Amino acid sequence: TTKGHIYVIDDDAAMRDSLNFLLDSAGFGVTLFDDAQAFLDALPGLSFGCVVSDVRMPGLDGIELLKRMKAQQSPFPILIMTGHGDVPLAVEAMKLGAVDFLEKPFEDDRLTAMIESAIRQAEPAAKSEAVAQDIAARVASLSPRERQVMEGLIAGLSNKLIAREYDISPRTIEVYRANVMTKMQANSLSELVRLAMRAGML
Q1: Are residues 14 and 43 in the same domain?
Q2: CB-side exposure of 158: number of CA atoms within 13 Å?
Q3: Number of C-beta neighbours around residue 18 at 10 A
Q4: How many domains, in total, are found in the chain?
Q5: CB neighbours (10 Å) of residue 127?
Q6: What is the full DSSP assignment across 18-36?
Q7: How buried is residue 11: exposed, middle or buried, by Cβ count under 10 Å (0-12/13-18/19+)?
Q8: Complete DSSP assignment for 41-61
Q9: What CATH number did the domain enclosing 149 receive?
Q10: DSSP for 93-139?
Q11: Are residues 138 and 108 in the same domain?
Q12: Of 126, 151, 182, which closes a domain?
């Protein structure tokens, strides 16, 4: 039992030691990486936690780390540690999705407060991930016309307008609707909308 797990990425041994110590005092669990690839190799097997990474890790600077993390659709929040000269690189990382940055040297409590906020904001999506991936799988199981019919239903088109808009035979609209509802496991249009919510289709 811990206040959250932290994945530290820093090629500087003294930073790793200093983070290791201060995060433990605050009650977090910690796993450390000195090598860019090592983190990415482990990443499919890691449980939810907050990443705290040097902005200029050799082989995974802040930009590259963020590009890979979202390629993996990771829900982990990322904080970037940086010297003042690399603040602009940290800026790019936040535009790509990093939660916040810290200019070194920073105080122990500024990091741990930032981590607490990051974990609190990211945890809900981490918790809802297996179901959102199930929903995405359902959406991917639709045929192309079924996907169009789902879109037309949510957009509020009549069956006649769905047929006309997508060039589907009128006699197949209810066939596709039924397939949509079964594959999505939706019991109504509102339910279909909320599934499209959780799959971010709006």
Answers
A1: yes
A2: 4
A3: 15
A4: 2
A5: 11
A6: HHHHHHHHTT-EEEEESSH
A7: middle
A8: HHGGGPPS-EEEEETT-TTS-
A9: 1.10.10.10
A10: HHHTT--EEEESS--HHHHHHHHHHHHHHHHHHHHTHHHHHHHHHHH
A11: no
A12: 126
Residue pointed to by tokens 């811990």: 2
What CATH number is given to the structural domain containing 105?
3.40.50.2300
Domain ranges, residue 73: 1-126
In sequence order, the 6+-apart residues with CB closer than 8 A to the CB of 171 are none
Method: X-ray
Is 167 strand, coil or helix?
coil
Instruction: Give the whole-angstrom CA distance, residue 185 versus residue 195.
Output: 9
Integer Cα distance of 65 and 78 in angstroms: 9
- Give the position of tokens 């594959």: 183
d(CA 82, CA 91): 10
The CA distance from 23 to 198, in Å, is: 34
- 100 and 76 together in one domain: yes
Contact 49, 92 (CB under 8 A): no
| Angle of the 173-184 helix axis to the 189-198 helix axis, nearest 10 | 60
- Residue 10 to residues 13, 50, 64, 142, Cα–Cα distance (Å): 7, 14, 14, 44
Q: In terms of domains, do 70 and 141 share one?
A: no
Q: Cα angle vertex 126, ends 38, 197, to 5°? A: 130
Of 105, 126, 147, the one marking the end of a domain is 126
